[PDB]
Structure 1
Amino acid sequence: AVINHDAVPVWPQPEPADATQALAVRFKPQLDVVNGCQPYPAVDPQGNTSGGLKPSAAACRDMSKAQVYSRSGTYNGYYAIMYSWYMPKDSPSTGIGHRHDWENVVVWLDNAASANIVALSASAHSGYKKSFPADKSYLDGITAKISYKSTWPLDHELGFTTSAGKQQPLIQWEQMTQAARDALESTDFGNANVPFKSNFQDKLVKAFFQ
């Protein structure tokens, strides 16, 4: 069930057991948290989930809690790696915003063997921002440079940035326990929505770049 936001353990990044998992490690992005919460763990291996924070960043700024998620798939012939972050709240100012935040970037490859980045999609309030072709100034090698930021009074959302960012231990949907996948599918995150549950393919359709 729901546990304290700061009591969800960080899920250690395992070794990649196959090429799917190795690719998601290889393309892990950088995140520049400009304002708002740092990313936190949303779920544990028993399927307990974060209770988040009431909108009211001192409670969500602990760098040791860093975590990133991913799920991989295909759409329209292209290979997609969705990276997703959970924040305990999305509150531009006191009395504005809501408990929980789920954001995601899609890294699009031509295919999983060639593994050329063809585009990037970053979640925002109106829908996905798209960089097509992927702007070289948003790439540190093959590492996408992403920002997390609220422009008041709008919710905190993702964007592309030239600034270097930080990385987090990655646990992939494909590496989770069944209890954790079940909890991410069924848990009510209120105004926020897990973007890599049974809605994954629908999100890829919205993130697609041409």
Structure 2
Amino acid sequence: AVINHDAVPVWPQPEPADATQALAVRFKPQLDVVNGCQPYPAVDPQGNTSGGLKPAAACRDMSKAQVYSRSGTYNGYYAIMYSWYMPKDSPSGHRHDWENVVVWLDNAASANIVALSASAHGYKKSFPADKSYLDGITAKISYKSTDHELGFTTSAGKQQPLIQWEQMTQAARDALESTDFGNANVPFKSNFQDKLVKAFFQ
């Protein structure tokens, strides 16, 4: 069920069990939280989910940091979607926030970044990928309200422990599929392919 936002444990990053999981670890992006909440854990292995916060002192604890990913393919390219949960999106807003960036690769072996798509109010798209947004192969993402949205940045960011959709318990996947996050939507549940279509760079 729903538990207190600050009581959801950080899911430790496991060793990658296969090449899908190792690749998502390798391309884990950096996030520069300019304003608003830090990323928090949204789900635990029993399928309890975050109750969020009613619309930053309650969502600034760096020890709660977490990032999610799901991998797949679309239209001949390889996609790794990285997603963050924030307990609220309140520029002065609503309970819960789900944001995601898609790192597009030509294929999972060559693993050349061909484009980046960042969620915003649709998707901002950097295609061909602007190298000033990459630290090596590490995309530099911002989280900022001017609603809080993702964007690309040249500023260095921070990283979080990654738990992948492919590494979660079934209870956690079921909870992410079924839970009402209100104005926010999990972008890597059964809508994953639909979101990749919207993120696609043409």
TM-score tier by shorter-chain length is over 0.9
SS of the aligned residue for 1:81 comes to strand
Question: How far apart are the structure 2 equivalents of 1:160 and 1:115?
Answer: 20
Question: How far apart are the structure 2 equivalents of 1:136 and 1:189?
Answer: 34
Question: How far apart are the structure 2 equivalents of 1:182 and 1:136?
Answer: 37
TM-score when normalising by structure 2: 1.00
Question: How far apart are the structure 2 equivalents of 1:157 and 1:19?
Answer: 30
Aligned length: 202
**What does the per-residue CA deviation read over 1:89-122, in whole Å, with 9 as the maximum and x for residues that have no partner?**
00000xxx10000000000000001000000000
C-alpha RMSD of matched pairs (Å): 0.2
Give the unaligned 5+ runs of structure 1. none
Question: How far apart are the structure 2 equivalents of 1:88 and 1:113?
Answer: 36
**What does the per-residue CA deviation read over 1:134-153, in whole Å, with 9 as the maximum and x for residues that have no partner?**
101000000000000000xx
**Aligned twin of 1:40:** 40
Question: How far apart are the structure 2 equivalents of 1:121 and 1:38?
Answer: 21
Question: How far apart are the structure 2 equivalents of 1:85 and 1:158?
Answer: 10
Question: How far apart are the structure 1 equivalents of 2:30 and 2:91?
Answer: 22
**What does the per-residue CA deviation read over 1:153-195, in whole Å, with 9 as the maximum and x for residues that have no partner?**
xx10000000000000000000000000000000000000000
**Aligned twin of 1:81:** 80
Question: How far apart are the structure 2 equivalents of 1:164 and 1:199?
Answer: 30
Give the unaligned 5+ runs of structure 2. none
SS of the aligned residue for 1:32 comes to strand
Q: In percent, how many aligned pairs have the same letter?
A: 100
**Aligned twin of 1:186:** 178
SS of the aligned residue for 2:96 comes to strand
- Segments of 4+ moved more than 6 angstroms: none
Question: How far apart are the structure 2 equivalents of 1:113 and 1:54?
Answer: 44
Find the partner of 1:177 among 169, 177, 182: 169
**What does the per-residue CA deviation read over 1:57-95, in whole Å, with 9 as the maximum and x for residues that have no partner?**
0000000000000000000010000000000000000xx
**Paired residues for 1:1-210 under 5 Å:** 1-55=1-55, 57-93=56-92, 97-125=93-121, 127-151=122-146, 155-210=147-202
TM-score when normalising by structure 1: 0.96
SS of the aligned residue for 2:171 comes to helix
Aligned-pair distance for 1:53? 0.1
